């Protein structure tokens with residue numbers, strides 16, 4: 001809708017700066033760790049599969065969890081309750097047919113009651129101050145894809161894959177804004193398949209040159225190269241499938 | 256929490272339960288208090304309330320009804336809104352014998368377009384523009400009002416929820432069952448309402464999808480591949496549709512001047528890519544002499 005492409009890009013760039021979780025948060029949590037959070041984010045992906053939830057839902061669920069945990073300490077025993085309630089909300093916000101509450105209770109193995117899941121939803125909303133319309137790496141990728149000539153189904157799916165992998169590892173990816181994690185993912189995808197670089201149209205549109213992307217791009221390069229041995233593997237399995245053209249399989253590049 | 260507010264009277268039922276008038280006992284402010292009922296069953300908090308509250312925290316604009324506060328109690332959720340005196344449905348019924356003056360109709364279209372352009376530029380479609388949800392005050396303002404069927408869109412769009420505007424104000428790309436609709440669906444609504452203020456009766460008042468669609472065809476003509484590329488292979492197109500001729504817009508809205516006709520035709524272009532955007536419409540010649548008169 002080129003009338004509002006720019007207004008919306010501009011506005012989601014204002015907004016991502018305000019839904020920013022505190023980078024340090026993990027260090028301040030008494031009980032949980034970057035690799036408990038990885039288990040949790042990998043588990044949500046598997047839930048997203050089991051109910052054919054949209055990629056957006058997953059990405060919002062993670063944005064809600066990182067903000068939640070930015071201001072609220074959570075024991076390991078409840079980390080998943082936080083994740084469940086977040087994934088419920090994301091679904092309600094984003095999906096045409098969100099899963100019933102009962103379905104989320106069923107996928108925690110009844111380690112939580114329905115009564116709990118609803119109370120947590122109320123609390124996650126109180127702490128997020130009802131501000132659930134968060135920018136995500138996915139909303140930037142999607143916009144970015146229109147500056148691609150020709151369009152390339154392989155590039156897009158790989159770009160999405162790297163954007164999704166970035167949700168697992170809170171260190172280092174918590175420090176990068178979503179518009180940047182998108183930039184990197186897109187360029188890394190474009191190089192891995194077509195051998196082209198971040199185009200000039202996207203420099204004119206975002207102001208990110210290929211060199212401002214470098215820091216993040218260095219990390220994403222490594223997550224991608226080390227992705228086979230990484231303990232959480234649901235995202236890799238996801239992107240083997242025909243839908244996403246099997247790009248998780250595609251062997252990463254040299255530098 | 257509610258200690259502060261005194262209920263005056265019920266006002267109506269919207270898209271998720273009851274709206275009341277109320278007084279802030281301490282500031283004296285009059286407000287509209289929308290009550291949602293919650294239950295450790297109801298799937299907790301409604302999807303419609305989640306989108307309304309979250310989207311409307313983002314939309315502060317003088318032509319969008321302002322959300323003042325959100326009160327969680329134990330089993331009740333109350334949304335405190337600014338109160339407006341009347342809606343455009345009631346006002347058109349009360350203004351039937353003498354018609355709405357052209358300056359006022361123009362004031363109101365301009366302000367609604369302003370509210371819409373704002374929504375749209377913050378990635379929000381309303382998806383329920385109709386006179387019941389456009390509120391007016393005695394000062395000559397008008398505001399958009401039920402953001403409970405709204406949703407945040409992406410660029411480009413996804414397939415969103417299907418049976419979606421109230422029938423009379425539903426755009427043809429929904430009725431024909433397309434994948435993608437976007438901002439253009441709200442403009443279509445607003446064009447219908449613009450017609451309705453001028454003539455005092457609904458432009459395409461069907462009682463089914465097919466009836467609604469034939470009504471549109473009889474006034475804009477049956478779209479073919481020339482006026483609407485793609486059209487004849489959309490999911491709910493039928494080659495067995497009748498072929499009506501497009502009517503001259505001087506006959507669709509006889510009170511309307513050379514320019515209002517232009518605007519209105521751009522709002523009701525069949526193709527959503529050529530259909531005027533709210534933002535572009537503010538610049539249209541029709542509005543060169545717009546002002547802000549008062550009603551009532």
Ligand SMILES: NS(=O)(=O)c1ccc(Nc2nc(-c3cccc(-c4ccccc4)c3)c3[nH]cnc3n2)cc1
Nearest residue numbers: 267268269287320336337338339340341342345387
């Ligand atoms: N009936 S009337 O024309 O004399 C009339 C009188 C007062 C109001 N005040 C009012 N209504 C709604 C509101 C929201 C959604 C739906 C409705 C509604 C409108 C008509 C009938 C039933 C409900 C009102 C608001 N939402 C946020 N603030 C609001 N303020 C509306 C219509």
